[PDB]
Every structure is written in structure tokens, then in C-alpha cells.
Design a protein around this nucleic acid. Structure first.
Ligand SMILES: [Zn+2]
Length: 267
DNA sequence: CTCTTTTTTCTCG
DNA sequence: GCGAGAAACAAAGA
């Protein structure tokens, strides 16, 4: 899940569980709660969900007066709202039970994490993570973006994936953004000219905002996505580029699968 | 059987 | 600090 998918899940949860009182919390995989499961169970049982926020790819449950549950879905994390009598599924790990239903977290690879922290510790938590600005015209300043790119010799794709230049890009959208901005994934950032950096900046915002609008790329929150039908290069190996007709190629960059058009994205 | 494929953060040199 | 490689872990395909 990348920013668009996490925002979609955030919106669905905001509309469905806010105001709900947590009756009980159970786990079959307590170790994914990095701050301690039994401690979380004792602290949150009986509290009411006040809201759901997001920072980068991180989900933030606002519970009770001063509690913040930080959830990261990593690669395969999935949330679903089910009936209280719903049967257990093989990869379900945690569940928050409410009066008329339950929120279940499942993760095949077990990479996802939960961390319970205080309201005043949220900003410090993300500062420590070094997460960059949200991908919006208001928060994503092109000037700083440009200066950081000009000082570096890192390849653009790996650098964007660091989450430090801007938050939210994953393997899918980084490939889509670079194709839209006509930049090759291995291009060293200090070689990007002003006009290209400007195109990149806007493309990052446009692609992600479009993905959010379309519910991301897909009983399972955030599965109604339509952005997958708008992808131009990710997983399109062998297919023809919609702009020039050349075949999309796939290579490895810093260990990640990378899709790009050899013509539109000159090395 | 073996090898490869699919977010975050550490290890090694 | 950096790049390269890989671990955390599970499933499916060549
Ligand atoms: Zn092309």
C-alpha cells in the first residue's frame, strides 16, 4: 500500500468507526504491536475512537483523549470490517471488537506494525522517522525540493523512495511519476534541470491526488480502487507506451523492479 | 528440490 | 554517511 491506498482506507474508517467504543481487543500475533500488546489491550479497551489521520503511508487512529495508534500496512497489510461472528481467516492477526462489528487486521507476510503512543509524541515520532512533506501544493515546496536534488548524486528513483524529499511514493507510483515526467529512474538528481524538476514536482502531486480520487489501485477496506486501470507503466512490461508506442521495459534499480519507456525516459 | 518475485531498516566494507 | 545486499515472512510460479 502506498499513500493513495492508505488514504482510501483512512477515509473509509473515518466514515465507519469514529464514535465507536472499543469493547475488546484480541490478537493471534501479538508481536506486531511494537509497544507491547498486553499494554495496548489494557490502555485502549473501553475507549472510543475519535478520528483517523494519516502521515505519509502511516495510519493514525485517534483513540480516547490522548492515545494515538500508529499503524503501518507495509507490503500486504489489509483491514476489514466484519460481523462479530465472522470466521477467522488464516492471516488475521489482530481485531478491535465493537458493539456491532469488528475491525480485523490481516497481513500475509507479517511486516505490518502497530505502535501506541501519546498525542504529544506524534510529531516527534515522525520527525525521528525523517518523513518528508505531504504531496500537496501547500506542503510540498518546490524550492527546497530543487535544492536537495541539486546537491545530490543519488539516482532519482531510489531517492524518491526514501520518503525524505516527499512522503507517500512507493514502487508503483514512483514508476508512474517518472514516466509522466519523462525522467529515467537511474538519472542522478544533480543532472535534472529546473524545468524537469518542476514537471516532476507537479507530476508527483497530480498522480497521487488522482490516485486518491480514484480510491487507489486495488469485505476489505480500500478494494474499490480504479487507479489500476490508469497505470501507464507499472507491471506493463512488454506493452506499448501510450505516448510513443515503444515497448515498456523492466529493469532492476537499487534492488527494486522498475518499469519505464526507453523513448520517453531517456537515460 | 532451487531460484525469483512482491515497505522499512539494518549490516557490511 | 553511502551503496549493495538482505532480513522480517509467506505464497506462487518458472
Ligand atoms: Zn514512450
Amino acid at each position: 500500500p502506498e499513500l493513495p491506498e492508505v488514504e482510501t482506507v483512512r477515509r473509509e474508517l473515518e466514515k465507519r468507526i469514529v464514535g465507536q467504543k472499543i469493547i475488546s481487543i484480541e490478537a493471534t500475533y501479538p508481536r506486531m504491536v511494537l509497544t507491547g500488546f498486553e499494554q495496548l489491550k489494557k490502555e485502549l479497551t473501553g475507549k472510543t475512537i475519535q478520528g483517523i489521520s494519516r502521515r505519509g503511508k502511516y495510519l493514525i487512529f485517534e483513540i480516547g483523549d490522548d492515545f494515538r495508534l500508529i499503524s503501518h500496512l507495509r507490503m500486504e497489510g489489509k483491514y476489514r470490517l466484519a460481523t462479530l461472528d465472522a470466521p477467522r481467516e488464516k492471516h488475521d492477526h489482530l481485531t478491535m471488537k465493537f458493539a456491532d462489528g469488528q475491525l480485523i487486521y490481516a497481513d500475509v507476510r507479517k511486516f505490518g506494525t502497530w505502535e501506541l503512543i501519546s498525542t504529544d509524541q506524534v510529531l516527534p515520532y515522525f520527525l525521528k522517522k525523517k518523513i518528508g512533506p505531504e504531496p500537496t501544493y501547500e506542503d510540498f515546496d518546490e524550492k527546497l525540493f530543487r535544492e536537495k536534488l541539486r546537491k545530490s548524486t543519488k539516482k532519482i528513483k531510489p531517492y524518491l523512495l526514501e520518503q525524505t524529499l516527499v512522503a507517500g511514493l512507493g514502487n508503483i507510483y514512483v514508476d508512474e511519476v517518472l514516466w509522466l515526467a519523462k525522467i529515467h529512474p537511474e538519472k542522478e538528481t544533480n543532472q535534472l534541470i529546473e524545468s524537469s524538476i518542476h514537471l516532476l514536482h507537479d507530476s508527483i502531486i497530480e498522480i497521487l491526488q488522482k490516485a486518491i480520487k480514484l480510491g487507489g489501485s486495488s469485505s476489505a477496506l480500500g478494494s474499490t480502487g480504479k487507479m489500476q486501470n490508469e497505470l501507464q507503466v507499472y507491471g506493463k512490461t512488454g506493452e506499448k507506451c501510450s505516448r510513443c508506442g515503444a515497448e515498456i521495459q523492466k529493469i532492476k534499480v537499487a534492488g527494486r523492479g522498475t518499469h519505464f519507456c526507453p523513448v520517453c525516459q531517456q537515460k
